Design a protein around this nucleic acid. Structure first.
Ligand SMILES: [Cl-]
Ligand SMILES: [Cl-]
Ligand SMILES: [K+]
Ligand SMILES: [Mg+2]
Ligand SMILES: [Mg+2]
Ligand SMILES: [Mg+2]
Ligand SMILES: [Mg+2]
Ligand SMILES: [Mg+2]
Ligand SMILES: [Mg+2]
Ligand SMILES: [Mg+2]
Ligand SMILES: [Mg+2]
Ligand SMILES: [Mg+2]
Ligand SMILES: [Mg+2]
Ligand code: NA
Ligand code: NA
Ligand code: NA
Ligand code: NA
Ligand code: NA
Ligand code: NA
Ligand code: NA
Ligand code: NA
Ligand code: NA
Ligand code: NA
Ligand code: NA
Ligand code: NA
Ligand SMILES: [Sr+2]
Ligand SMILES: [Sr+2]
Ligand SMILES: [Sr+2]
Ligand SMILES: [Sr+2]
Ligand SMILES: [Sr+2]
Ligand SMILES: [Sr+2]
Ligand SMILES: [Sr+2]
Ligand SMILES: [Sr+2]
Lengths: 56, 65, 46, 81, 194
RNA sequence: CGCACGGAGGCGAAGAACCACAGAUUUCCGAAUGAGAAUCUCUAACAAUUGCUUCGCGCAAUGAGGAACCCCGAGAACUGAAACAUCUCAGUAUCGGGAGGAACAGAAAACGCAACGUGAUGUCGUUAGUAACCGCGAGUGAACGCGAUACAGCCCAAAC
RNA sequence: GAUACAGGGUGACAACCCCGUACUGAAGACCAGUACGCUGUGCGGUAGUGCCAGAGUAGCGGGGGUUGGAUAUCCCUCGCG
RNA sequence: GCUUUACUGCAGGCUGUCGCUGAG
């Protein structure tokens, strides 16, 4: 079986969904954690300094 | 337009609560004629009915019911 | 798939957003729905 | 605060229920229960409600199919409003 | 004449001698079976507590904190590091055990502010420090001409910003002259070379 | 009678529109705090951690956000050295915690143009690429003083 | 015309067509709950008195980090004091 | 990337010593 086109057919699982906190389609319904804002993981909002260039 | 601010303040707390239910029924019956797609409408009155209900509710808060 | 009440409200909204820009807006602005989403071609959230 | 009855649902299927089954259809608030829809209809129209059937429409609203008693006539109630 | 306080002070000069030696051997057995942060009604060292700012008043709290002995509890590099940065065993932290104690205490009490702390001994594996904490919201303090300074908005979370005496001493701020070129006004202002 | 020049209709001399200040309203999720949940639901709620305490959540505090700035911790490598290990990049990037409208510092167990002198602290100019460091290689690098800015000095512990 | 010839608009190059612009005046915010003023308290000096004046500290040693800090930086850690 | 009696180091194991640590 090829890792390409024939392995794409099995992809019917729902993981990333609309988040209650930030509104982005990043709430992993199996992990109960948001990959965008960190909802489910932290009380604080997920922000990182590398999301922008060092001197910006 | 037909209902002014001074006229609502001249009213007693029980007259406002009575006028509120009167306007809510005129609003529901305007929305009903709009639901049927009727022609003998008045687009400017359905707009005023909402503003008037707001005015009575604002006066109810101001006077302490 | 089984939808929840909130999921239904969102899908309901997305369907309404899919209607055309009314005939009168064209006359008022004196002359495009950029959020045109198709069930097959495009993809919604969740 | 929110009102229970928003406006009456008047379509072809709504009229069939009114003419033949004595049922009045309403677009109600999505937080309202079957019992709360029953009470509000008995108060705003002065009728006796027997059964309420609710459906959450693909419009974001809640549609309620309200059946009246034999004493009341749905065709007569919908004509005055 | 000598104060009664001066006797508690003179006893703590040598905590391994006299009556205090027996008192510590006994008290530590109970302390080892207590928590990480334990609120206590009265300070073990009254002289030191009063000297540091403690008053037997409302809103003045004291708590004993036990922190582990030794160097850094550090993980080895999981990526490429030059010989210099390949250390695990001999690395020590830049904050002293007293400061780790003050911080653990202030977190257990999110409304209170750290006034000061002092050492109350150690065994072979842990160190104990008692921390004097103050309630900035209690009127018993908001009216105290000696402690009301701690009620100011800018004194909020003061321990975490190193504004404690143990903080300022660890930041190399003791000396006013030679040796404090890279420490004053702050370590961060001097590019972290202190 | 928004963007927005339509149609129908409406509002305004009972002074509307519009602007300023103040107030009313202000759904659900959200630190999110009764419990659970992809913004909904289930049966009275300061959840959790604390201080005070009538020891009752009765009175209070914390939580999270903010462009960067600020303070306290953790802390690379590419690179430079024409290789490379100390060194360098650099206490930089990045990470953890935290405050403010600015932070931090601060009234000498100072300085040490050694004096019959200076007199809290930041910062700016200079001192100076000087002293000092360094496979004494490449490189690294202050301070006192001076001229300015602005100035402001106080409270405990103990003795009785 | 001009204490106004800054700028813009207006069917083409506008001081004088329109908004503005100089002049004069008003308000809010910041400075600042600061300065000044006031109330209260009470500054200071002589002689006598070994009454008081902050400890794991000052300091020493083992191991590290950091710094220009070199024997002579600052800090952490273990032991001693 | 990988190897080793390549260079230099870092974990880890073994071992002495100091602290915890006391009476005869
Ligand atoms: Cl604190
Ligand atoms: Cl001088
Ligand atoms: K390197
Ligand atoms: Mg459709
Ligand atoms: Mg159903
Ligand atoms: Mg390299
Ligand atoms: Mg600064
Ligand atoms: Mg909840
Ligand atoms: Mg190279
Ligand atoms: Mg060379
Ligand atoms: Mg350097
Ligand atoms: Mg000097
Ligand atoms: Mg170095
Ligand atoms: Na699709
Ligand atoms: Na509707
Ligand atoms: Na705290
Ligand atoms: Na609002
Ligand atoms: Na609260
Ligand atoms: Na309580
Ligand atoms: Na090279
Ligand atoms: Na190479
Ligand atoms: Na070197
Ligand atoms: Na040492
Ligand atoms: Na240093
Ligand atoms: Na390879
Ligand atoms: Sr599968
Ligand atoms: Sr988690
Ligand atoms: Sr962040
Ligand atoms: Sr497709
Ligand atoms: Sr529809
Ligand atoms: Sr806080
Ligand atoms: Sr001065
Ligand atoms: Sr002294």
């Amino acid at each position: 079986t090829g890792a390409g086109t024939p392995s794409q057919g099995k992809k019917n699982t729902t993981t990333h969904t609309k988040c209650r906190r930030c509104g982005e389609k990043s709430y992993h319904t199996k992990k109960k954690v948001c990959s965008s804002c960190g909802f489910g993981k932290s009380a604080k909002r997920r922000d990182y300094e590398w999301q922008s260039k060092a001197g910006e | 337009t037909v209902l002014h601010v001074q006229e609502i303040r001249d009213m007693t707390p029980a007259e406002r609560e009575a006028e509120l239910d009167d306007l809510k029924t005129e609003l529901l019956n305007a929305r009903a004629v709009q639901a049927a797609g009727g022609a003998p409408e008045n687009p400017g009155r359905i707009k005023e009915l909402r503003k008037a209900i707001a005015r009575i509710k604002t006066i109810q808060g101001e006077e302490g019911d | 798939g089984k939808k929840s009440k909130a999921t239904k409200k969102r899908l309901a909204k997305l369907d309404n957003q899919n209607s055309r820009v009314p005939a009168w807006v064209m006359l008022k602005t004196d002359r495009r729905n950029h959020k045109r989403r198709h069930w097959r071609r495009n993809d919604t959230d969740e | 605060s929110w009102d229970v009855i928003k406006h009456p649902h008047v379509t072809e299927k709504a009229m069939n229920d009114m003419d033949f089954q004595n049922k009045l259809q309403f677009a109600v608030d999505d937080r309202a229960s079957k019992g709360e829809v029953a009470d509000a209809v008995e108060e705003q129209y002065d009728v006796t409600v027997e059964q309420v059937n609710t459906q959450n429409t693909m419009d974001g609203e809640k549609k309620a199919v309200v059946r009246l008693s034999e004493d009341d006539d749905a065709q007569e109630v919908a004509s005055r409003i | 004449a000598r104060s009664a306080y001066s006797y508690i002070r003179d006893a703590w000069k040598n905590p391994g001698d006299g009556q205090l030696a027996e008192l510590q051997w006994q008290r530590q057995q109970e302390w080892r079976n207590e928590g990480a942060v334990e609120r206590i009604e009265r300070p073990t060292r009254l002289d030191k507590a009063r000297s540091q700012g403690y008053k037997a008043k409302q809103g003045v709290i004291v708590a004993r904190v036990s922190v582990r002995k030794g160097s850094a509890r550090k993980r080895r590099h999981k990526a490429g590091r030059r010989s210099k940065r390949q250390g695990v065993t001999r690395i020590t932290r830049r904050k002293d055990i007293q400061r780790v104690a003050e911080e653990r205490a202030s977190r257990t009490f999110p409304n209170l502010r750290v006034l000061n702390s002092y050492s109350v001994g150690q065994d072979g594996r842990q160190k104990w420090h008692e921390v004097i904490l103050i309630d900035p919201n209690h009127p018993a303090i908001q009216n105290d001409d000696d402690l009301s300074w701690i009620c100011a908005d800018d004194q909020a979370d003061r321990v975490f910003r190193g504004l404690t005496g143990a903080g300022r001493r660890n930041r190399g701020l003791s000396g006013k002259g030679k040796g404090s070129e890279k420490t004053r006004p702050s370590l961060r202002s001097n590019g972290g070379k202190g």
